[PDB]
Amino acid sequence: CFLVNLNADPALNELLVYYLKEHTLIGSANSQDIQLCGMGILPEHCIIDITSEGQVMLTPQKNTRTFVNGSSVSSPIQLHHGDRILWGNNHFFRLNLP
């Protein structure tokens, strides 16, 4: 269970993969499990939860730039394998579920 950075150039010394936890905090703060910095990202920006029963749910924080498969999202939404997430300006990721 991981997030693929779709903008990582394989030919560069760039991080491609972020593994998710059961409860994953995403944002710019040191406290976040996946720490992303850049335009349009909040200290606390998003939350991904993996349910006991294998279900993946994304919960945006208020007032955040958040799209799933190209459309904006402002309440909890279930993710599937291969779903594309945009956070902020250009934090563009793809979801791999096992």
Q: How many residues does the chain have?
A: 98
Please report whether residue 8 would count as binding another protein according to CB under 8 A: yes
Question: Which tokens belong to 22?
Answer: 């059961």
Please report whether residue 1 would count as binding another protein according to CB under 8 A: no
Binding another protein (rule: CB under 8 A), the pick from 31, 51, 72, 74 is 72
Binding another protein (rule: CB under 8 A), the pick from 3, 79, 86, 87 is 86
Please report whether residue 84 would count as binding another protein according to CB under 8 A: yes
Q: Which of residues 10-49 bind another protein (CB under 8 A)?
A: 10-11
- DSSP label at 54? S
- The DSSP secondary structure of 32-47, one letter per residue, reads -SEE--STT--SS-EE
Residues binding another protein (CB under 8 A): 6-11, 67, 69-72, 83-84, 86, 89-90, 92, 94
